[PDB]
Amino acid sequence: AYQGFTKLGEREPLNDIILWEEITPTGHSRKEYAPVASTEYRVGEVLKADGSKVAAGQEAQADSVCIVNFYADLQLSYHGQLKVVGIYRDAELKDLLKLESGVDAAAVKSALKAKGIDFVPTGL
Amino acid sequence: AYQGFTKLGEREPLNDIILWEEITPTGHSRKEYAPVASTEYRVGEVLKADGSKVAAGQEAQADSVCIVNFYADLQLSYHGQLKVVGIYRDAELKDLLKLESGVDAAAVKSALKAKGIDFVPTGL
Amino acid sequence: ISLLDAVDRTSRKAETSAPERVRQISFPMMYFKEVESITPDEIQGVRQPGTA
């Protein structure tokens, strides 16, 4: 283009982080979340109890791991769902986390470890 | 002096106390430990977080039940493995346990019960 | 093996050789494990790259 290039972006994360979860007729490791206004959700980000993300100093309040892509513009998920679903009970997930600036990964994992969540070393 | 007899030894316990456990792609119910120097592990011995055995007064610090036989001088398990492992999460084990001197069996059982381990009564 | 020294003949002197030596060693092995899973969530409504 005008400066030679035109990047158009890349694909959002797919929900392949789940390796093992407690299968149950009504769902066991999944809980619904009311999306916070003007908030964007992607697969991997850690959520607090109210539904917001985890900032610096709030690692011990890690509640769940998002497994949906939510858009604040449409107020809908990428699968046409009204609510955000995260993994909070016992499960095993790939180590493809998504944390904001200043968040301690080890502290966040420790909070989820005590809640039954296990992480597998992924690598590249 | 050959005092009459020669006892070559007694067979170390086999890994058969596991009756049921939450088995996943990875070790959901089993965790790894770094062996402590000059420490011998057998199957059915309770370990603390650091990897040492539970002594008198430390019954509430019980972490896991060892399920492999480790040789201190050889520094290898009886399966040719480098690290000792034990069951710490939810599982059902046989009542046969090897505790140290002056260790309250009931206190150890209650500590492991809270983590998720239950002990089926075994009889003979 | 070693060299041999000459001795006198009238005196019936001689010499001998040392025995052999044996040992034993052991080897452990390395264990590798890899796990993967596939779910409908990564297939539903996903465009194949390179296609419209």
Side-chain angles (χ1 to χ4, degrees), chain A residues 1-123, chain B residues 1-123, chain C:
Chain A
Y2 172 93
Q3 272 228 336
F5 48 129
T6 318
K7 320 307 211 343
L8 301 185
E10 304 228 335
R11 130 227 208 98
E12 291 121 327
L14 298 194
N15 174 357
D16 71 358
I17 51 165
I18 299 284
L19 285 186
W20 175 86
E21 90 174 315
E22 189 92 51
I23 305 300
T24 300
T26 61
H28 174 102
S29 311
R30 301 152 178 256
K31 75 186 293 211
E32 271 166 29
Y33 279 110
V36 177
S38 274
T39 297
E40 273 274 350
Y41 297 96
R42 296 304 191 244
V43 172
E45 337 188 343
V46 180
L47 309 166
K48 277 201 310 276
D50 51 278
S52 44
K53 320 301 181 44
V54 163
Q58 289 162 9
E59 294 90 350
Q61 317 183 346
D63 198 350
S64 76
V65 170
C66 207
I67 58 175
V68 290
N69 297 332
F70 204 80
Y71 304 118
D73 313 318
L74 328 176
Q75 278 296 282
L76 289 190
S77 87
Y78 76 121
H79 277 164
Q81 296 316 129
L82 305 192
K83 326 199 64 62
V84 177
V85 158
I87 285 282
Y88 77 121
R89 217 103 64 97
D90 36 43
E92 302 185 326
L93 299 102
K94 319 227 281 219
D95 206 0
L96 303 168
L97 274 198
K98 262 181 221 294
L99 320 166
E100 333 192 296
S101 93
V103 198
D104 167 356
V108 163
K109 294 212 241 203
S110 147
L112 302 158
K113 164 53 101 163
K115 264 182 41 63
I117 289 197
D118 268 8
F119 291 92
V120 182
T122 66
Chain B
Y2 186 49
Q3 284 274 319
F5 0 160
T6 326
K7 315 260 203 63
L8 267 42
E10 213 208 78
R11 178 200 253 172
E12 329 110 308
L14 279 168
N15 164 358
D16 67 8
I17 52 140
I18 290 149
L19 266 185
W20 173 90
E21 56 152 9
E22 274 279 358
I23 82 193
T24 70
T26 77
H28 200 71
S29 307
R30 31 182 86 188
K31 72 180 301 210
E32 95 158 27
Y33 291 88
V36 198
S38 70
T39 280
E40 297 254 8
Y41 306 86
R42 308 287 145 195
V43 175
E45 301 196 0
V46 189
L47 319 171
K48 319 205 293 283
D50 72 358
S52 34
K53 322 308 201 340
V54 159
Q58 339 184 307
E59 284 96 322
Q61 293 164 50
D63 195 349
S64 50
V65 171
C66 189
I67 67 187
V68 279
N69 302 306
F70 208 75
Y71 301 118
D73 73 81
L74 199 65
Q75 283 280 297
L76 277 199
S77 93
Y78 74 128
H79 272 340
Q81 286 321 119
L82 261 66
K83 327 201 83 52
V84 85
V85 301
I87 300 285
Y88 79 117
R89 270 223 189 90
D90 35 14
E92 317 218 349
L93 307 179
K94 268 168 204 215
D95 213 328
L96 311 93
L97 267 202
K98 321 217 302 179
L99 309 152
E100 301 219 329
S101 292
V103 154
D104 203 358
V108 169
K109 292 260 193 84
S110 77
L112 294 176
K113 179 150 167 180
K115 294 182 52 33
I117 317 175
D118 275 36
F119 280 105
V120 190
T122 199
Chain C
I1 206 81
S2 151
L3 220 51
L4 204 168
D5 307 333
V7 277
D8 203 310
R9 175 170 176 267
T10 295
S11 67
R12 320 292 210 229
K13 294 292 181 280
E15 54 179 20
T16 323
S17 72
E20 51 160 339
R21 180 171 81 120
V22 316
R23 302 169 285 180
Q24 203 150 43
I25 55 177
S26 97
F27 292 83
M29 318 169 217
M30 303 155 97
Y31 195 81
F32 303 98
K33 184 188 208 197
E34 166 107 353
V35 291
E36 251 299 335
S37 90
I38 192 190
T39 45
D41 300 328
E42 54 194 289
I43 298 133
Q44 162 83 15
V46 155
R47 174 171 74 79
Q48 174 89 286
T51 60

